[PDB]
Ligand binder design. Sequence first.
Ligand code: UDP
Length: 505
Amino acid sequence: RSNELSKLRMRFFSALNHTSEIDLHTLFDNLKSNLTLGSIEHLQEGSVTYAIIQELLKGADAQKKIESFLKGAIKNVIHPGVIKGLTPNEINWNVAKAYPEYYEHEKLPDVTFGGFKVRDSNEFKFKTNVQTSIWFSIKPELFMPSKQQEALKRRREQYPGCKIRLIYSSSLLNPEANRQMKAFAKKQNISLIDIDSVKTDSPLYPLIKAELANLGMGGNPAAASDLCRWIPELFNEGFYVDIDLPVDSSKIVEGHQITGGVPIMLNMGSIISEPIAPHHRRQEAVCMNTDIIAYANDRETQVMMDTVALHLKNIYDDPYTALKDTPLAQTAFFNRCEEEGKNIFELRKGLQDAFRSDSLLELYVFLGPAKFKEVFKLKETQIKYIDDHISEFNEHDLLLHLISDNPSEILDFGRAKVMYMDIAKEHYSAFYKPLVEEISGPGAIYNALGGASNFTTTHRRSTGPMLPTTPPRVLQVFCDAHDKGPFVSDNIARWQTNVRELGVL
Ligand SMILES: O=c1ccn([C@@H]2O[C@H](COP(=O)(O)OP(=O)(O)O)[C@@H](O)[C@H]2O)c(=O)[nH]1
């Protein structure tokens, strides 16, 4: 009646850059029976449609050619694209494929991701309104700390009526924490799944129960959480999101549906390296994280989840191969555990006990001479003499050898000991994290889906609108759940981040 037609016309003239090489009033008029606001976005500078229009304006008969092109582009590519949940990149590629006379472009390369060839058909569909999170409590009295409760209250009470599913373990909570779990879930209309009574043939189910039963004995609940994410009976649609992740309102799509070229998508970015030999060129390496994971409503989802599940099973069965390039692998303790066939729980627990002993002699047995050398910055001859004589040393004798040999580094024996133990503790995190990250975590998944060399290529930029014509672009356009979904993550690098300026905590 009509302030809506007026917003539409202003968006249109704005998108096409207020040009008068043609008559935007007539073009507008001739397109408006089939023009919606959602379509205009794919007409702006940066889009393939815009770039075609710029070349068509330099041509004779601009007005009519532009009109024909746009009627067609909107009707057959863009508008069915918007209705289906396609991104600007997916729509751009679809225009390029439809108008090869107007947009020169290469073929879709052959890229494998989890045993599956990435497609540009847009056939995998994913719900954004179905969200599953995992909270395994390490405190029997406490079902979930307040911060995670509020995060759940916020995603709901901001953004219904998405469905919210919460996996937990009853067996980790005392009866009172349990009753409080059920009431929290009921009050917040959360679908609750107890991991203790779930039915599945997955190999990952015993590993999950064991990580949880082994709490206090090297078991880790983030590692159990990680594994749950590859069990088809638990995840077969919607999203996995870290319980703590925020929703960006403006990113919610109105059909609550997005698409992909693989049936399981993840949070992805990439790192541009320093120049490498022999041509002094930068490499782009794709990185991926499991803080956000999307699962298509489709049989191909179960097949990709089973390839990944067989890789994780493998790692739990022999973790030494997975941890081979990590810092813990340089220690005497890891060597020994490897001979002895210790499992990941004893590896983790052994590591913990060593840094809880408050004993430099025990730290030495753990680290061994090479790693003890590097950690306390010793000269070769100094560690050689320590190692030769270690079976004669008490705790003070070792301490006296450190003091003579360095500081620098850190006149009272009690304080000097603390200074030296605290230097050793600086390395704890670097020793521990991979025992989750490279076992069930983002490092294991990365390898399960293809690893370092499936996902690294020579960095090539441009030109103009991004199309999926090299392997990292294929993955950027078609396989990344973070960009396409409504959750925010600063947990890994964004796409095409220089290794120098990383921006991560
Ligand atoms: O006590 C815990 C700790 C974590 N986790 C699981 O492991 C993930 C931990 O990742 P974290 O949130 O610590 O990474 P961040 O949010 O800091 O990026 C959580 O989402 C949970 O699913 C859990 O179940 N219980």
